[PDB]
Amino acid sequence: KEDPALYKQQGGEYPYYSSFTIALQKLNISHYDSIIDMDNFISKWAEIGRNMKPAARDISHDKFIEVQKTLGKIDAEWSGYHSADVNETFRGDTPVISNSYSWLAEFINESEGKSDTVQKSMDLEIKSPLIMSTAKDPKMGYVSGKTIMWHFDLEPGHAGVSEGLYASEGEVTFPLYNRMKITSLQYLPEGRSYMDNPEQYGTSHRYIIKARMLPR
Ligand SMILES: [Br-]
Ligand SMILES: [Cl-]
Ligand SMILES: [Cl-]
Ligand SMILES: [Cl-]
Ligand SMILES: [Cl-]
Ligand SMILES: [Cl-]
Ligand SMILES: [Cl-]
Ligand SMILES: [Cl-]
Ligand SMILES: [Cl-]
Ligand SMILES: [Cl-]
Ligand SMILES: [Pt+2]
Ligand SMILES: [Pt+2]
Ligand SMILES: [Pt+2]
Ligand SMILES: [Pt+2]
Ligand SMILES: [Pt+2]
Ligand SMILES: [Pt+2]
């Protein structure tokens, strides 16, 4: 009856996990179990982890092994986690994520400072490069003030779980490499609200990403 390995990634060691998955992106590693050049990975990982708030400073071969195994365990455990049964979830991100998603950077660059709303329809399937937390309610304070908001449509058989450290506060989490289909990007001028519903969505999002969470 072990606690979910997911807790290890969500707590105070988050910067180590976050920086590890960032390193996987930066080095184009296909899978966390298939890291051929340990030394180069560790070096990059350490660089990223020193810039986190709070700083991930104890990066080493031991910490490498710990993080890799934990990621492994999270995926091994995944089917045993409580599936979330909501139809939709929401996420707030800062503009930093434009650095991970070139389609988003482009759309932001083209849209920025326009006086009217703009949508761009998409059909792009991606594998998510993080373990991604999402909220049931877009009003949560950690979502509502962010520049970018995702609006997730959960398809039956999706991989979102109500499990871990903030499950009792409405957090639904998705696994590393979770499949999603980007269907729409929207731009919202200052003062404008998603779906023109300020009371639900506020006025702080400039960009909305609509996406579908696909079966596991
Ligand atoms: Br992550
Ligand atoms: Cl971090
Ligand atoms: Cl940071
Ligand atoms: Cl951070
Ligand atoms: Cl595309
Ligand atoms: Cl709430
Ligand atoms: Cl929530
Ligand atoms: Cl909630
Ligand atoms: Cl809605
Ligand atoms: Cl609405
Ligand atoms: Pt960070
Ligand atoms: Pt090593
Ligand atoms: Pt696109
Ligand atoms: Pt909530
Ligand atoms: Pt909250
Ligand atoms: Pt709506």
The technique by which this structure was obtained is X-ray
Whole-number Å distance between alpha carbons of 76 and 6: 11
Is there a contact between 210 and 186 (Cβ–Cβ < 8 Å)?
Answer: yes
Domain edges within the chain: 1-216
Resolution (A): 1.8
Q: How far is the CA of 176 from the centre of ligand 5 (A)?
A: 21
Amino acid at 60: S
Whole-number Å distance between alpha carbons of 8 and 2: 12
Contacts (Cβ under 8 Å, ≥6 apart) of 197: none
Q: Which of 215, 216, 97 is nearest to 149 (CA)?
A: 97
Provide the residues around ligand 8 (an ion) whose CB is within 5 A: 136-137, 170
Q: How far is the CA of 142 from the centre of ligand 15 (A)?
A: 7
Q: How far is the CA of 203 from the centre of ligand 3 (A)?
A: 24
Q: How far is the CA of 136 from the centre of ligand 14 (A)?
A: 6
Whole-number Å distance between alpha carbons of 131 and 3: 18
Tell me what percent of the chain is helix, strand and coil, each rounded to the nearest 5: 35, 25, 40
Helix intervals (H) in 11-82:
14-26, 38-50, 61-77
Q: Find where tokens 């060691």 sit.
A: 13
Q: How far is the CA of 189 from the centre of ligand 1 (A)?
A: 31
Whole-number Å distance between alpha carbons of 42 and 58: 11
Q: Find where tokens 């986190």 sit.
A: 52
- Write out the two tokens for 27: 């080095």
Whole-number Å distance between alpha carbons of 77 and 53: 28
Q: How far is the CA of 155 from the centre of ligand 11 (A)?
A: 30
Q: How far is the CA of 207 from the centre of ligand 10 (A)?
A: 16
Contacts (Cβ under 8 Å, ≥6 apart) of 4: 74, 77, 81, 163, 164
Q: How far is the CA of 137 from the centre of ligand 6 (A)?
A: 6
Please provide residue 32's backbone torsions phi and psi, each rounded to the nearest 5 degrees. -60, -25
- Write out the two tokens for 151: 């609006």
Q: How far is the CA of 102 from the centre of ligand 12 (A)?
A: 32
Q: How far is the CA of 62 from the centre of ligand 8 (A)?
A: 37
Q: How far is the CA of 32 from the centre of ligand 10 (A)?
A: 39
Whole-number Å distance between alpha carbons of 6 and 81: 10
Q: How far is the CA of 204 from the centre of ligand 2 (A)?
A: 23
Q: How far is the CA of 51 from the centre of ligand 12 (A)?
A: 22
